[PDB]
Design a protein around this ligand. Structure first.
Ligand SMILES: Nc1nc2c(ncn2[C@@H]2O[C@H](COP(=O)(O)OP(=O)(O)CP(=O)(O)O)[C@@H](O)[C@H]2O)c(=O)[nH]1
Ligand SMILES: [Mn+2]
Ligand SMILES: [Mn+2]
Length: 603
C-alpha cells in the first residue's frame, strides 16, 4: 500500500518508531515516492546525477567531484522572524522582557503552530519523492551523540546532510529501537507548481516557517531549501533542540569551534570559541599559526557539545561531520586550510563560477587567467563594474571534515576532548582590547552574556547564541552558572578577544588571522599559570604578548581601556540584561554587573 511507493530500501527494515514516523508523515504530505537513504557513494552519485539533470546543481569541472547550487534569491539565509520555538509556556522559551519585544528568541503557542502546520503540510510533497535520512549528530555510537530522522522533499538536503552528518544505513543500525529527534522538512511547492520556479530552486518564502517542539522532540520546517532552515541538524537540532536537552541532562550545546593547539614543547590544549556570524570561527578553527613551532588542529568549526567527565573535565565533541563555511573572504592567505579542504567532494551554494568551471567570490584574492570570465551567483556575466558581489555574501561551501589537512586526531573520539579554555568575542571597532581574561567563572559567564558585535549597527549577541537559544536565556545563564557547583569541576579559563579594533581611519589595529596564534600563546600559558589587572579583567602585561616577526603594532591603542567608553558599555550592558532578561536574570549576573560598574568608577 505504502510499500508500493518505496523506491529504495524497505519499510520492514526500519525500527518501528522510525516507520511510524515515516508512515504518518507520508500520509500527510502525500509524496509520490519514498526513498530510504542508505548513505552510500552510489546513492550520492545517483542523487547528484539526478540533480545535474534537473538543473538543481551544476558540475564544477575544475575540481574532483564539486558541485554548485544556485538558489532563488528569495531563499538565501535563515530568517529569525520566521524561526520559532513552541512550548506551552512562553517563559520556558524566552524571558518576558520589561519593554519592547524579546530579542532572545521567538515563541509561538502550541495552538498557533497547530494552525500553521495544517495550513502548510497536508498535500505538500505531491509529485515529489520523500527522502528518509537517518543521521547521527556526533560520532556513531558516542555517549555524547544523538540521532535524528529527517524527512525531506529536497535531494539537496540529502546530499548536504551526507556531508554535514553521519548518514545512512549504519545510523539506522545504531539507533535500533532508540529514541530519535523527529525532523520534518518540505520545500513547500507540491507539483504542479503553482508558482514560478527560479533556478530550479523550490521555496515558499511566504509560508516559510521553522519550528522546534522540544517537548515532543520534533523539528518542523516549511518553505525554505536553504542551509539552516533545511539541513535540520546544522542549527535546529545541534543548537536549538540540543541546548534544551542539554539543559535537561547536565551538558552544553553551543555555537563554538573547538581546536587543539600545540606548543613547541609538545604540550597540547583544546580550546573552544564562540563568535557570531562574520566573526571568524572558521578561520580560527583551522588556522595556520604564524608562530614557529606551534601547531593548531581542528576539531570542529561551528558547534560544540560539552559534558563534564568523571574527573570534572569539560569534554567537547563536534556533533557535525563537516564544515558549512561562509565562502566569501576565504583565500589562501586568510584560510589556507579551508582552501585545501574544499578542493574535493564539496557542494557550494550561491558562489560565482569561472569559465573554466572553478568557483569564485569576493575576497578569494585569486587572479583569473587570461580569458577566464565569471558568472555570478545570479547567473549573469559579471564584472567589478557592477555594483553587486559576484557571490552571495553568505554563500557557503559544504565540505567533509575528514578532508581538512589539519583535522585533529581526536575529532571523532567518542569521549570528546578536554576543554581548557573558552573564548568569547565579536567585532568591536572601538574600546575593547585585543584580549582580556575573565576574573572568575561568574564574571566569565557575564562576559559571554555581555557580548556585542557590529553587524553600522552594533548588536547584542550573548554567547553568540542570540538566534539559537532553545529555551529561556535567563535559565541558560543559570545553567552555565551552575557548572561552578559541579563536584570537582575543572573550569575552563574564560577569555574575550576582539580581532577587529580600529584606529581612527578605520584600519585594523591587529593583523589577525594566522597572527592570532600570538593571542593563543598568551592564553595557553595563562592556562599553565602573566597578567595585568584592569577593571574588565586581566590583559597581558607589558611585553608579554609575543610580537616577534610582526610589523609595528600600536599596542597602546590596542589595549587601551577608557573610562568614558566603559562607562558607556556597562550602562548599555546593564540595561540590556535587565530589560531583556528581566525576571529571569540570575543574581550572580546582577552582581557581576554591579561589580564591573564598581570597578570602573574607581578608574
Ligand atoms: N580582520 C580580521 N578579519 C577576520 C579575522 N578572522 C576572520 N575574519 C573575517 O571574518 C569574516 C569571515 O568570518 P565567518 O567565516 O563568517 O565566521 P564564522 O564564525 O565561521 C561564521 P558562521 O558560523 O556562520 O559559519 C571575514 O570578514 C574574515 O575577514 C581576523 O583575525 N581579522
Ligand atoms: Mn563558519
Ligand atoms: Mn554558525
Amino acid at each position: 500500500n505504502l510499500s508500493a511507493k518505496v523506491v529504495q530500501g524497505s519499510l520492514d527494515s526500519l525500527p518501528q518508531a522510525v516507520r511510524e514516523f515515516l508512515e504518518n508523515n507520508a500520509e500527510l504530505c502525500q509524496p509520490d515516492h519514498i526513498h530510504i537513504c542508505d548513505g552510500s557513494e552510489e546513492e550520492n552519485g545517483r542523487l547528484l546525477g539526478q540533480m545535474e539533470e534537473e538543473g538543481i546543481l551544476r558540475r564544477l569541472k575544475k575540481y574532483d567531484n564539486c558541485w554548485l547550487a544556485l538558489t532563488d534569491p528569495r531563499d538565501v539565509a535563515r530568517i529569525e522572524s520566521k524561526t520559532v520555538i513552541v512550548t506551552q509556556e512562553q517563559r520556558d522559551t524566552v524571558p518576558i522582557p520589561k519593554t519592547g519585544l524579546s530579542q532572545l528568541g521567538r515563541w509561538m503557542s502550541e495552538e498557533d503552530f497547530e494552525k500553521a502546520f495544517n495550513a502548510r503540510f497536508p498535500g505538500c510533497m505531491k509529485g515529489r519523492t520523500m527522502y528518509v535520512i537517518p543521521f547521527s549528530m556526533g560520532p556513531l555510537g558516542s555517549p555524547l551523540s544523538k540521532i535524528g530522522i529527517e524527512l525531506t522533499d529536497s535531494p539537496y538536503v540529502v546530499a548536504s546532510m551526507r556531508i554535514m552528518t553521519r548518514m545512512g544505513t549504519p545510523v539506522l543500525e545504531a539507533l535500533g529501537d532508540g529514541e530519535f529527534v523527529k525532523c520534518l522538512h518540505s520545500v513547500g511547492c507540491p507539483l504542479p507548481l503553482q508558482k514560478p520556479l527560479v533556478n530550479n530552486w523550490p521555496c515558499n518564502p511566504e509560508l516559510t516557517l521553522i519550528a522546534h517542539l522540544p517537548d515532543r522532540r520534533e523539528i518542523i520546517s516549511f518553505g525554505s531549501g536553504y542551509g539552516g532552515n533545511s539541513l535540520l541538524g546544522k542549527k535546529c537540532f545541534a543548537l536549538r533542540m540540543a541546548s534544551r536537552l542539554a539543559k535537561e541532562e547536565g551538558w552544553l550545546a553551543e555555537h563554538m569551534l573547538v581546536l587543539g593547539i600545540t606548543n613547541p614543547e609538545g604540550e597540547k590544549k583544546y580550546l573552544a570559541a564562540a563568535f557570531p556570524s562574520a566573526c571568524g570561527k572558521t578561520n580560527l578553527a583551522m588556522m595556520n599559526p604564524s608562530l614557529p613551532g606551534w601547531k593548531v588542529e581542528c576539531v570542529g568549526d561551528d558547534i560544540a557539545w560539552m559534558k563534564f567527565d568523571a574527573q570534572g573535565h569539560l569534554r567537547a565533541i563536534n556533533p557535525e561531520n563537516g564544515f558549512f563555511g561562509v565562502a566569501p573572504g576565504t583565500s589562501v592567505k586568510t584560510n589556507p586550510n579551508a582552501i585545501k579542504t574544499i578542493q574535493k567532494n564539496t557542494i557550494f551554494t550561491n558562489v560565482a563560477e569561472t569559465s573554466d568551471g572553478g568557483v569564485y567570490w569576493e575576497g578569494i584574492d585569486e587572479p583569473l587567467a587570461s580569458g577566464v570570465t565569471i558568472t555570478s551567483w545570479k547567473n549573469k556575466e559579471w564584472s567589478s563594474e557592477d555594483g553587486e558581489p559576484c557571490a552571495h555574501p553568505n554563500s557557503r561551501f559544504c565540505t567533509p571534515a575528514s578532508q581538512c589537512p589539519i583535522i585533529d586526531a581526536a575529532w571523532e573520539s567518542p569521549e570528546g576532548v578536554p576543554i581548557e579554555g573558552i573564548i568569547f568575542g565579536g567585532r568591536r571597532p572601538a574600546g575593547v582590547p585585543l584580549v582580556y581574561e575573565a576574573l572568575s567563572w561568574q564574571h566569565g559567564v557575564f562576559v559571554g552574556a555581555a557580548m556585542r558585535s557590529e553587524a553600522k549597527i552594533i548588536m547584542h549577541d550573548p554567547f553568540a547564541m542570540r538566534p539559537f537559544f532553545g529555551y529561556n536565556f535567563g535559565k541558560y545563564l543559570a545553567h552555565w552558572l551552575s557548572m561552578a557547583q559541579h563536584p570537582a569541576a575543572k573550569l575552563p579559563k574564560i577569555f574575550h578577544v576582539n580581532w577587529f579594533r580600529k584606529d581612527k581611519e578605520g584600519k585594523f589595529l591587529w593583523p589577525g588571522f594566522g597572527e592570532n596564534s600570538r593571542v593563543l600563546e598568551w592564553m595557553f600559558n595563562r592556562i599553565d599559570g602573566s597578567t595585568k589587572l584592569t577593571p574588565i579583567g586581566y590583559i597581558p602585561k607589558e611585553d608579554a604578548l609575543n610580537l616577534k616577526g610582526l610589523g609595528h603594532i600600536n599596542m597602546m591603542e590596542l589595549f587601551s581601556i577608557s573610562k568614558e567608553f566603559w562607562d558607556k558599555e556597562v550602562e548599555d550592558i546593564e540595561k540590556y540584561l535587565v530589560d531583556q532578561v528581566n525576571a529571569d536574570l540570575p543574581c550572580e549576573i546582577e552582581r557581576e554587573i554591579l561589580a564591573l560598574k564598581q570597578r570602573i568608577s574607581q578608574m
